[PDB]
Design a protein around this ligand. Structure first.
Ligand SMILES: Nc1nc(=O)c2c([nH]1)N=C[C@H](CNc1ccc(C(=O)N[C@@H](CCC(=O)O)C(=O)O)cc1)N2CO
Ligand SMILES: Nc1ncnc2c1ncn2[C@@H]1O[C@H](COP(=O)(O)OP(=O)(O)O)[C@@H](O)[C@H]1O
Ligand SMILES: [Mg+2]
Length: 164
């Protein structure tokens, strides 16, 4: 349904979310997230993101679950307008394969688990460098589901953790 039309629609529905609901959906999601990792304590370095246009938020206790398990959290930083890189708190940059798992922010997703981002293409571009079959998990509210045809360059997400 044209990636652009489906963006404005979902993005707007997400911006109209009430604090209490958002809170109720982020809590649920962060919990499915903690229960998602524990059963495979192999992730030593994980890719997160800094919630922006009302995206799913990462809660305090989630950051604590990573703290007591010595898991490093690296975040995306746009270099120019070409590519993005991932760095940690001390600002050291970790190469693509130094990252064991990617928790990705998104606007929408279709039945084939393809992502719909801001339209820049940084993630599709980046996530092609992963040669370790690292998990590409999309984080999102259950209503971010959308019907759109994927382009040849679109990266397919392995799992889409949502409030369900
Ligand atoms: N929290 C988060 N959300 C994201 O979806 C996002 C992020 N992290 N992680 C890195 C990339 C970068 N996404 C970007 C999206 C848009 C523009 C951009 O074009 N900015 C406009 C601003 C609009 C304006 O004021 O005109 C510009 O042209 O300046 C840059 C980077 N990304 C994707 O998952
Ligand atoms: N892996 C890639 N290599 C080269 N160009 C890309 C790649 N991925 C995306 N692009 C370009 O960047 C743009 C990103 O648009 P789009 O895929 O719709 O963004 P989004 O993933 O945020 O929905 C596309 O028009 C495309 O031409
Ligand atoms: Mg794409």
């Amino acid at each position: 349904m044209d990636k652009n039309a489906l963006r404005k629609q979902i993005l707007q529905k997400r911006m109209a979310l009430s604090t209490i609901e958002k809170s109720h959906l982020d809590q649920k999601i962060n919990q499915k997230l903690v229960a998602f990792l524990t059963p495979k304590p192999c992730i030593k370095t994980i890719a997160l993101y800094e919630p922006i246009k009302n995206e799913v938020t990462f809660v305090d206790f989630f950051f604590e679950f990573l703290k007591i398990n010595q898991i490093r959290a690296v975040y995306p930083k746009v270099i120019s307008d070409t590519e993005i890189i991932f760095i940690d708190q001390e600002t050291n940059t970790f190469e693509p394969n130094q990252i064991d798992c990617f928790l990705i922010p998104l606007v929408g997703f279709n039945k084939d688990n393809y992502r719909l981002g801001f339209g820049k293409g940084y993630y599709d571009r980046y996530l092609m460098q992963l040669t370790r079959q690292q998990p590409k998990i999309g984080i999102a509210y259950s209503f971010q589901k959308g019907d759109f045809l994927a382009d040849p360059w679109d990266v397919q997400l392995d799992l889409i953790i949502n409030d369900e």
